Design a protein around this nucleic acid. Structure first.
Lengths: 84, 150, 158, 129, 190
RNA sequence: GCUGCAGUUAAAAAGCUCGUAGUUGGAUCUUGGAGGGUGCGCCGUCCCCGCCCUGCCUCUCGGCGCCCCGGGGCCCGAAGCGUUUACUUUGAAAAAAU
């Protein structure tokens, strides 16, 4: 705190380190993804932290299990984010 | 911070700005309202519907893809149940604690806790009642509560 | 309605006379009771109930012999235990300089309530007007029922 | 919890200037905070400020020079009677000459000088010098 | 002609007539007709940009907008090209209701909807002036001279459709509210 | 000790928490030009004021009035008239003595 910051334009790096609620103007720190499993060809959208089992469209498969935080995606899987 | 303890803990959603979106979100109001109603048929709570919707199927907030909160959707279909859910789970919790205390008359901690829960209930009901949701004269009673929650 | 007349004495408005009479239909005559009313003034609409009604109430401001002069007050209805009379609670602010915050204070005021008003229910805000001593306690008379289903805490309908 | 929001904004400022700070981020802001920040601004006691729009209640960045000894808030918002304004400024202002008592009147949030000129009065918000 | 689509309580004309005709010109076509046809407009107003290329502002019923949103980009592209020398866009007429006083009188007129407030409406104007981008954030700057300026943050992607426009959005906005608006770009959370 | 007190150790925070009264309660709904007072020798200096660079409706009533076949409809003062207040502001009403 040396009488030097531009509270209005703070850096993206140290904004990105701060608590989601402590951010200049707030915003979350969580995201969505599309997920693959070769056998099917279509793609289920999933939330980064998830609580629910998420199962795919048809195959009783799996597609992550939950945790304290981010859902752990399951073994042989792929995932683009992603939007805006 | 916190009401019935000394806990401080800040913890939250952090809801998004962006006014509109998601944009990568196609589907439609049609779609998710059907989804909601069908889930609520199955007995699911609005909290629960919001979660399962969130993670399994694309719905960041049901509010955004439909100008209405999940509970309001339920109530408009005709799925709203008798008392609000928070009040339910409180009443249910005080029930389970009460059943445990009847079993174990020696547990003073439990007696303290039962009080806390119960106070939280009475205040919440006072609030719901003030606001018409509950008929003025609504009260939670051990005797009848057990019978009420199930 | 309920038979008014109820008591032992024949209830009637003074100096409003009858005379029924012979011939056909009615029979006598159809209304069978001439009724006399007046508007209180101060722009208080004399409710239909007063004109339409059978009830006697000398104490009534519209139908009865009482004049409304003096203070016109408003209060919230605390009690409607007594027949034809109510108790209203009047909140007011008391100013205390000696150091300065004044503290809410209240007074209850007994006030006669004509049968013309109904749904006088506790919680209702009401406008009463000063009057000649009706009874040892009662100085006032309910002139207008302010109402509201509002105060929502429930949903009123019509 | 929170009773008032102004008192926080003002204090935050005062501690900024006391440190030797030249900016602050107050939260959460309000029409009344803006109006007060504005009266301060007109007079010089702060530089320019900026209301950032979280989708919540707001956050303000004030850029401050250093002409500010103190900006206080009066709670509760006592009613003042035109010849209690004369009594207030004397209670809490450095010299008769300067510093402002800022109050809220039916005709706007204003410094008491503007109050005297309009010839209206009301309830006291706070002050500065 | 004038009767149909320039209506909304006044016939009128000239530009409204031209643009309407342009819509018809577009109407001949395929999928670039039938989808539009439903759409209708209340009025057009023209206001300039400082060196002197004018901007044309179009007014919509508001229940309509979702459909207008449906096309927008493609249509605006056509209107800019056919009608060139102008910045075209789309604003929805919104009602705005006055805050009651008191003695305004007050015969407690039916509540009113936030979705009727002057500020909310203005916010809507800002939202309408830019399009598919999104307003990421906002700030208000209090100038030394009692002035206020609103910094309206913008997204990033697809912006280009708006990039050249910006100045007009500022001017257009001014004509409506009398407030000053400024535009910026962000950042990308990491 | 309102303004304007002290309570770790000096006299003084209940062992702790629940809790009714009472008190206390987030953000957010409208955006120069001249008139009059006293200073300085026809000129001006310095306040104060309505301005430039937002009560609706009526049009139980009355009619300013607009259109229809005695029947109708509509629609400056006055009227309708107030959503409630607190507040504050401007008046009156405000014993003499003091």
């Amino acid at each position: 705190m040396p009488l030097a910051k531009d509270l209005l334009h703070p850096s993206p790096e140290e904004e990105k380190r701060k608590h989601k609620k402590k951010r200049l103007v707030q915003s979350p720190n969580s995201y969505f993804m599309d997920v693959k499993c070769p056998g099917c060809y279509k793609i289920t959208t999933v939330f980064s932290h998830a609580q629910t089992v998420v199962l795919c469209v048809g195959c009783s498969t799996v597609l992550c299990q939950p945790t304290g935080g981010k859902a752990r995606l399951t073994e042989g899987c792929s995932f683009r984010r992603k939007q805006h | 911070g916190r009401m019935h303890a000394p806990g401080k803990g800040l913890s939250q959603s952090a809801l998004p700005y962006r006014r509109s979106v998601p944009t990568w979100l196609k589907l439609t109001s049609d779609d998710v309202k059907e989804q909601i109603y069908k889930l609520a048929k199955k007995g699911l709570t609005p909290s629960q519907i919001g979660v399962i919707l969130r993670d399994s199927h694309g719905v960041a907030q049901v509010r955004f893809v439909t100008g209405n909160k999940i509970l309001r959707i339920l109530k408009s279909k005709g799925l709203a149940p008798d008392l609000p859910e928070d009040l339910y789970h409180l009443i249910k919790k005080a029930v389970a604690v009460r059943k445990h205390l009847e079993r174990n008359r020696k547990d003073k901690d439990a007696k303290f806790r039962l009080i806390l829960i119960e106070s939280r209930i009475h205040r919440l009901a006072r609030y719901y009642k003030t606001k018409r949701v509950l008929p003025p004269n609504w009260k939670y009673e051990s005797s009848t509560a057990s019978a009420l929650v199930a | 309605m309920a038979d008014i007349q109820t008591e032992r004495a024949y209830q009637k408005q003074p100096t409003i006379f009858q005379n029924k009479k012979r011939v056909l239909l009615g029979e006598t005559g159809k209304e069978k009771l001439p009724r006399y009313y007046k508007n209180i003034g101060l722009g208080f609409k004399t409710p239909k109930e007063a004109i339409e009604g059978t009830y006697i109430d000398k104490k009534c401001p519209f139908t009865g012999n009482v004049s409304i002069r003096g203070r016109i007050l408003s209060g919230v209805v605390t009690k409607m235990k007594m027949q034809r009379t109510i108790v209203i609670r009047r909140d007011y602010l008391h100013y205390i300089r000696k150091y300065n915050r004044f503290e809410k204070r209240h007074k209850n005021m007994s006030v006669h309530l004509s049968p013309c008003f109904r749904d006088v229910q506790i919680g209702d805000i009401v406008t009463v007007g000063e009057c000649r001593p009706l009874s040892k306690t009662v100085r006032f008379n309910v002139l207008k029922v302010t109402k509201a289903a509002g105060t929502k805490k429930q949903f009123q309908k019509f | 919890v929170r009773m008032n929001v102004l008192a926080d904004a003002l204090k935050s400022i005062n501690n900024a200037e006391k440190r030797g700070k030249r900016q602050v981020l107050i939260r959460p802001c309000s029409k009344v905070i803006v109006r007060f920040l504005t009266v301060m601004m007109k007079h010089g006691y702060i530089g320019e400020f900026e209301i950032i729009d979280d989708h919540r209640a707001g956050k303000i960045v004030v850029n401050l020079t250093g002409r500010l000894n103190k900006c206080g808030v009066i709670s509760p918002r006592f009613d003042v009677q035109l010849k209690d304004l004369e009594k207030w400024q004397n209670n809490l202002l450095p010299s008769r000459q300067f510093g402002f008592i800022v109050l809220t009147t039916s005709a706007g949030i204003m410094d008491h000088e503007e109050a005297r000129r309009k010839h209206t009065g009301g309830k006291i918000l706070g002050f500065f010098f | 002609s004038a009767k149909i689509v320039k209506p909304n309580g006044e016939k009128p004309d000239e530009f409204e007539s031209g643009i309407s005709q342009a819509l018809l010109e577009l109407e001949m076509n395929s999928d670039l007709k039938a989808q539009l046809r439903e759409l209708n407009i209340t009025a057009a107003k023209e206001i300039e940009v400082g060196g002197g290329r004018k901007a044309i502002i179009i007014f919509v019923p508001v229940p309509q907008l979702k459909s207008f949103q449906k096309i927008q980009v493609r249509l605006v592209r056509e209107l800019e090209k056919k009608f060139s020398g102008k910045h075209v866009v789309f604003i929805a007429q919104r009602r705005i209701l006055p805050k009651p006083t008191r003695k305004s009188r007050t015969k407690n007129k039916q509540k009113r909807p936030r979705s009727r407030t002057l500020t909310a409406v203005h916010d809507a104007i800002l939202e309408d002036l830019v399009f598919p981008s999104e307003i990421v954030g906002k700030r208000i700057r209090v100038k030394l001279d009692g002035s206020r300026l609103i910094k309206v943050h913008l997204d990033k992607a697809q912006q280009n459709n708006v990039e050249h426009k910006v100045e007009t959005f500022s001017g257009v906005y001014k004509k409506l509210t009398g407030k000053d608006v400024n535009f910026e770009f962000p950042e990308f959370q990491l």
